Amino acid sequence: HWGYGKHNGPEHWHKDFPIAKGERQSPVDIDTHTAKYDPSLKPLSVSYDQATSLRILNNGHAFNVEFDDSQDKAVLKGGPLDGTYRLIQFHFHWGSLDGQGSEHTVDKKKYAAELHLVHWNTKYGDFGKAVQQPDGLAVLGIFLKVGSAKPGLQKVVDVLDSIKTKGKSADFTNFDPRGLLPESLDYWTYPGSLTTPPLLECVTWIVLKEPISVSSEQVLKFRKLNFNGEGEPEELMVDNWRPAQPLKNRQIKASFK
Ligand SMILES: O=C(O)Cc1cccc([N+](=O)[O-])c1
Ligand code: NI
Ligand code: NI
């Protein structure tokens, strides 16, 4: 019974999942001065025109916006990737305060939140099989800073009161994830892992350099969510970020100079 507390948080996970101390764990600090610009990198193709959102779920550690991944409707290709990656869900990680919440850091800077768009490699046929492979997933990571409102986020924010507690879901159709992307697709990339148990080392991370801006009011609404189930004592869903892990023998590549 893992979580983010003193007694069951990141620092304990290794007892259940020894891979926590592995060679390609995420997140990491992105040292912008040491990331090397890579000309091998093919351009990033995000093709979200046909995306079909289905549902939003409070899974007890975050909320997930789920997509129909039964066809190539919302796909990521190019960049560091070989082949086609289908969108399955997005989620966020966030803090109790505006000064923390992101998982990746940039020259040690923590953002207020981080958006993760999770995609699986179609050559493996389904998500469950893909997470067993070193190239199974591609996660597009976007930092959130507090400032102006993000209009394309509001639809997510307003349904959160209907999924307050663990296990609640709501229909969430017709949501366009393009409205959560910054202007530029410049990125850093490196090989890593999921950042919750089971911590599988199956992710090619693609972290965008340009943050999106959300309002204070928008982030506040994330912090009203609950880790607990209905009828259990209230524990606010905040600080659901794993801290930076050792880079070990990895290189972070930049798509830009
Ligand atoms: O890395 C995370 O935010 C945790 C996580 C946990 C389980 C599945 C996930 N996913 O990528 O569908 C992500
Ligand atoms: Ni458990
Ligand atoms: Ni994540």
Short mmCIF file of C-alpha atoms and ligand atoms in Angstrom, two decimals:
data_model
loop_
_atom_site.label_atom_id
_atom_site.label_comp_id
_atom_site.label_asym_id
_atom_site.label_seq_id
_atom_site.Cartn_x
_atom_site.Cartn_y
_atom_site.Cartn_z
CA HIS A 1 0.00 0.00 0.00
CA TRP A 2 2.19 2.57 -1.55
CA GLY A 3 1.74 6.24 -1.82
CA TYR A 4 3.40 9.58 -1.30
CA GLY A 5 3.60 9.83 2.59
CA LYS A 6 6.23 9.51 5.12
CA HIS A 7 5.50 5.99 5.68
CA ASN A 8 4.76 4.67 2.21
CA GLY A 9 6.36 7.20 -0.18
CA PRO A 10 9.12 7.07 -2.77
CA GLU A 11 11.81 6.39 -0.38
CA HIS A 12 10.08 2.98 0.53
CA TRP A 13 9.17 1.73 -2.90
CA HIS A 14 12.37 -0.19 -3.45
CA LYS A 15 11.30 -2.81 -0.86
CA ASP A 16 8.48 -3.93 -3.07
CA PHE A 17 10.03 -3.00 -6.44
CA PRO A 18 13.79 -3.39 -6.43
CA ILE A 19 13.84 -1.82 -9.91
CA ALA A 20 13.45 1.51 -7.96
CA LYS A 21 17.23 1.47 -7.60
CA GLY A 22 17.79 0.51 -11.27
CA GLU A 23 19.81 1.95 -14.12
CA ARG A 24 17.13 3.89 -15.96
CA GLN A 25 14.74 5.35 -13.37
CA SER A 26 12.72 8.49 -13.79
CA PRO A 27 12.33 11.36 -13.29
CA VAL A 28 15.71 13.08 -13.52
CA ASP A 29 17.09 16.54 -13.32
CA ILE A 30 17.66 17.98 -16.81
CA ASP A 31 21.02 19.78 -16.75
CA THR A 32 20.50 22.13 -19.70
CA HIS A 33 24.14 22.87 -20.11
CA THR A 34 25.14 19.25 -20.33
CA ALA A 35 22.31 18.00 -22.64
CA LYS A 36 23.75 17.63 -26.11
CA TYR A 37 22.07 18.81 -29.24
CA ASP A 38 21.47 15.76 -31.47
CA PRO A 39 21.21 16.23 -35.31
CA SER A 40 20.25 12.47 -35.63
CA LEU A 41 16.87 13.53 -34.14
CA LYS A 42 14.01 13.24 -36.82
CA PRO A 43 11.33 16.00 -36.40
CA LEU A 44 8.38 15.22 -33.53
CA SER A 45 5.02 14.49 -35.09
CA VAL A 46 2.03 14.84 -32.83
CA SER A 47 -1.19 13.75 -34.69
CA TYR A 48 -4.12 14.33 -32.43
CA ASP A 49 -6.81 15.34 -34.93
CA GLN A 50 -8.85 12.16 -34.54
CA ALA A 51 -8.42 11.71 -30.78
CA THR A 52 -11.33 10.21 -28.96
CA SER A 53 -11.42 10.89 -25.21
CA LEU A 54 -13.69 8.60 -23.23
CA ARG A 55 -13.54 8.97 -19.49
CA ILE A 56 -11.79 10.63 -16.54
CA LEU A 57 -10.86 8.45 -13.57
CA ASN A 58 -9.49 9.19 -10.07
CA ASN A 59 -7.16 6.21 -9.62
CA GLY A 60 -6.13 7.10 -6.07
CA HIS A 61 -2.85 8.67 -7.00
CA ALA A 62 -3.83 11.03 -9.92
CA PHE A 63 -6.59 11.42 -12.38
CA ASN A 64 -6.35 9.94 -15.83
CA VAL A 65 -8.10 11.18 -19.00
CA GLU A 66 -8.50 8.03 -21.05
CA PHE A 67 -8.65 7.68 -24.84
CA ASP A 68 -9.82 5.09 -27.32
CA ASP A 69 -6.53 3.37 -28.24
CA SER A 70 -8.17 0.61 -30.35
CA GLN A 71 -7.12 2.44 -33.61
CA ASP A 72 -4.42 4.97 -34.77
CA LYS A 73 -6.47 7.94 -33.83
CA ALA A 74 -4.03 10.00 -31.72
CA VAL A 75 -0.39 9.15 -32.41
CA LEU A 76 3.12 10.26 -31.69
CA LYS A 77 5.90 9.59 -34.08
CA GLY A 78 9.29 10.98 -35.06
CA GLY A 79 11.79 12.57 -32.73
CA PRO A 80 13.73 9.89 -31.12
CA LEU A 81 11.05 7.28 -31.82
CA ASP A 82 11.05 4.43 -34.24
CA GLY A 83 7.57 3.54 -35.30
CA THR A 84 4.10 4.70 -34.10
CA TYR A 85 2.96 5.31 -30.55
CA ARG A 86 -0.78 5.53 -29.69
CA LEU A 87 -2.17 7.81 -27.00
CA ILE A 88 -3.82 5.92 -24.16
CA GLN A 89 -4.17 8.52 -21.39
CA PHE A 90 -2.89 11.69 -19.90
CA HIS A 91 -2.43 12.68 -16.26
CA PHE A 92 -0.71 15.28 -14.13
CA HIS A 93 1.62 15.41 -11.18
CA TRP A 94 1.37 18.44 -8.90
CA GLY A 95 2.30 19.98 -5.59
CA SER A 96 0.84 21.31 -2.39
CA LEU A 97 2.39 24.69 -3.24
CA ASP A 98 3.21 26.42 -6.48
CA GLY A 99 6.92 26.00 -5.84
CA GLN A 100 6.94 22.22 -6.30
CA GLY A 101 4.97 19.53 -8.17
CA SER A 102 6.82 18.60 -11.28
CA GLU A 103 8.73 15.30 -11.51
CA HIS A 104 11.40 16.41 -13.93
CA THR A 105 13.40 19.43 -12.94
CA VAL A 106 15.33 21.82 -15.20
CA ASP A 107 18.63 22.97 -13.72
CA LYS A 108 17.10 22.00 -10.37
CA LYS A 109 14.00 24.19 -10.98
CA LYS A 110 10.69 22.59 -9.96
CA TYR A 111 7.54 23.61 -11.80
CA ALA A 112 4.06 23.70 -10.21
CA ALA A 113 2.89 20.60 -12.14
CA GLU A 114 3.75 18.34 -15.05
CA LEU A 115 1.46 16.88 -17.72
CA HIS A 116 2.20 13.40 -19.02
CA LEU A 117 0.69 12.21 -22.32
CA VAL A 118 1.25 8.43 -22.33
CA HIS A 119 1.61 6.52 -25.59
CA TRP A 120 2.38 2.86 -26.36
CA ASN A 121 4.28 1.35 -29.25
CA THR A 122 1.91 -0.26 -31.68
CA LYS A 123 4.31 -3.00 -32.55
CA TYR A 124 3.48 -4.59 -29.20
CA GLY A 125 -0.27 -4.75 -29.77
CA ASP A 126 -1.52 -3.45 -26.45
CA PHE A 127 -0.40 -1.38 -23.46
CA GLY A 128 0.12 -4.36 -21.19
CA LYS A 129 2.56 -5.98 -23.51
CA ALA A 130 4.28 -2.67 -24.33
CA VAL A 131 5.19 -1.93 -20.68
CA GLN A 132 7.26 -5.14 -20.75
CA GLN A 133 9.54 -3.75 -23.39
CA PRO A 134 12.41 -1.27 -23.19
CA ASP A 135 10.88 0.78 -26.00
CA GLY A 136 7.29 0.17 -25.08
CA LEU A 137 6.11 3.63 -24.07
CA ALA A 138 6.68 7.22 -25.09
CA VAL A 139 5.66 9.88 -22.59
CA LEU A 140 5.40 13.49 -23.68
CA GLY A 141 6.04 15.66 -20.64
CA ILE A 142 4.93 19.30 -20.39
CA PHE A 143 5.68 21.61 -17.49
CA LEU A 144 3.02 23.81 -15.95
CA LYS A 145 3.81 27.22 -14.44
CA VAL A 146 1.29 29.41 -12.64
CA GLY A 147 0.30 32.59 -14.47
CA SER A 148 -2.39 33.10 -17.07
CA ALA A 149 -5.22 30.54 -17.34
CA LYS A 150 -4.98 27.80 -19.90
CA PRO A 151 -8.33 27.83 -21.65
CA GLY A 152 -7.97 24.30 -22.97
CA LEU A 153 -7.57 22.96 -19.44
CA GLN A 154 -10.83 24.35 -18.08
CA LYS A 155 -12.96 21.45 -19.19
CA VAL A 156 -10.74 19.11 -17.14
CA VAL A 157 -10.78 21.41 -14.13
CA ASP A 158 -14.53 21.72 -14.02
CA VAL A 159 -15.28 17.95 -13.96
CA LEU A 160 -12.90 17.32 -11.01
CA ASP A 161 -15.61 17.81 -8.40
CA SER A 162 -17.34 14.72 -9.87
CA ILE A 163 -14.31 12.51 -9.35
CA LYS A 164 -13.20 13.71 -5.97
CA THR A 165 -12.37 10.36 -4.46
CA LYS A 166 -10.52 7.22 -5.41
CA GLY A 167 -12.37 5.02 -7.85
CA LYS A 168 -14.78 7.61 -9.17
CA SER A 169 -15.05 8.10 -12.93
CA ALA A 170 -17.05 10.30 -15.24
CA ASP A 171 -17.74 10.40 -18.95
CA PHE A 172 -15.28 12.74 -20.67
CA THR A 173 -15.95 12.77 -24.36
CA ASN A 174 -14.93 15.22 -27.01
CA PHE A 175 -11.86 16.61 -25.23
CA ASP A 176 -9.12 17.88 -27.53
CA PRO A 177 -5.62 17.41 -26.00
CA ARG A 178 -4.12 19.84 -28.54
CA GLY A 179 -5.30 22.59 -26.34
CA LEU A 180 -2.76 21.54 -23.66
CA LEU A 181 0.38 21.89 -25.87
CA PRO A 182 2.79 24.88 -25.88
CA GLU A 183 3.73 26.67 -29.05
CA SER A 184 7.10 24.99 -29.53
CA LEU A 185 7.87 21.26 -29.74
CA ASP A 186 11.54 21.66 -28.82
CA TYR A 187 12.41 18.86 -26.42
CA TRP A 188 14.85 16.90 -24.37
CA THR A 189 14.82 13.08 -24.49
CA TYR A 190 16.28 10.22 -22.51
CA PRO A 191 15.49 6.55 -21.65
CA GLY A 192 13.69 6.06 -18.35
CA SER A 193 10.84 4.52 -16.42
CA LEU A 194 7.40 4.86 -15.02
CA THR A 195 7.43 6.98 -11.91
CA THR A 196 5.03 4.97 -9.80
CA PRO A 197 5.13 1.32 -8.91
CA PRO A 198 5.83 -0.95 -10.67
CA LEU A 199 8.54 1.48 -11.93
CA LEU A 200 9.03 -0.39 -15.20
CA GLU A 201 11.94 0.70 -17.36
CA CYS A 202 9.90 0.97 -20.55
CA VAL A 203 9.70 4.71 -21.31
CA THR A 204 11.27 6.98 -23.89
CA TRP A 205 10.78 10.38 -22.26
CA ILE A 206 10.22 13.44 -24.41
CA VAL A 207 10.14 16.57 -22.19
CA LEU A 208 9.18 19.80 -23.82
CA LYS A 209 11.29 22.86 -23.12
CA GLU A 210 8.43 25.39 -23.21
CA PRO A 211 6.05 25.27 -20.24
CA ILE A 212 2.34 26.01 -20.46
CA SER A 213 0.79 28.59 -18.14
CA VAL A 214 -2.21 27.71 -15.94
CA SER A 215 -3.94 29.97 -13.43
CA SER A 216 -3.68 29.74 -9.71
CA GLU A 217 -7.37 28.89 -9.61
CA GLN A 218 -6.92 26.01 -12.05
CA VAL A 219 -4.12 24.38 -9.95
CA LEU A 220 -6.10 24.96 -6.78
CA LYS A 221 -8.77 22.73 -8.15
CA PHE A 222 -6.32 19.89 -8.63
CA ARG A 223 -5.44 20.19 -4.93
CA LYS A 224 -9.08 19.57 -3.89
CA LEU A 225 -8.96 16.06 -5.16
CA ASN A 226 -8.61 13.22 -2.61
CA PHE A 227 -6.31 10.20 -2.46
CA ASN A 228 -8.89 8.38 -0.30
CA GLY A 229 -12.06 6.68 -1.23
CA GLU A 230 -15.47 8.05 -0.39
CA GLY A 231 -16.35 7.49 3.27
CA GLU A 232 -12.71 7.32 4.34
CA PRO A 233 -10.82 10.10 6.07
CA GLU A 234 -9.88 12.97 3.69
CA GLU A 235 -6.40 13.19 2.42
CA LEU A 236 -5.81 15.80 -0.18
CA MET A 237 -4.27 14.61 -3.45
CA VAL A 238 -1.12 16.77 -3.48
CA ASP A 239 2.58 16.13 -3.92
CA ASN A 240 2.07 13.07 -6.15
CA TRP A 241 5.50 13.46 -7.72
CA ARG A 242 8.49 11.22 -7.40
CA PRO A 243 11.72 13.19 -6.82
CA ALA A 244 14.60 13.16 -9.29
CA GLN A 245 16.61 9.95 -9.50
CA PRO A 246 20.23 9.37 -10.38
CA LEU A 247 21.07 9.76 -14.07
CA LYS A 248 23.61 6.91 -13.96
CA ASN A 249 24.95 6.02 -17.34
CA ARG A 250 22.49 8.10 -19.44
CA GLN A 251 22.75 11.00 -21.72
CA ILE A 252 19.99 13.57 -22.20
CA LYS A 253 19.68 14.75 -25.80
CA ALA A 254 18.26 18.09 -27.01
CA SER A 255 16.37 18.57 -30.18
CA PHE A 256 17.42 22.26 -30.35
CA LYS A 257 20.54 24.38 -29.90
O1 LIG B 1 4.65 7.20 -14.54
C1 LIG B 1 3.54 7.65 -13.98
O2 LIG B 1 2.96 8.75 -13.90
C2 LIG B 1 2.91 6.52 -13.29
C3 LIG B 1 2.15 5.60 -14.20
C4 LIG B 1 1.62 4.44 -13.69
C5 LIG B 1 0.93 3.53 -14.41
C6 LIG B 1 0.75 3.78 -15.72
C7 LIG B 1 1.17 4.98 -16.15
N1 LIG B 1 1.01 5.12 -17.41
O3 LIG B 1 2.09 5.60 -17.86
O4 LIG B 1 -0.25 4.61 -17.94
C8 LIG B 1 1.90 5.92 -15.53
NI NI B 2 -0.15 -1.47 -1.99
NI NI B 3 3.39 10.50 -14.90
#
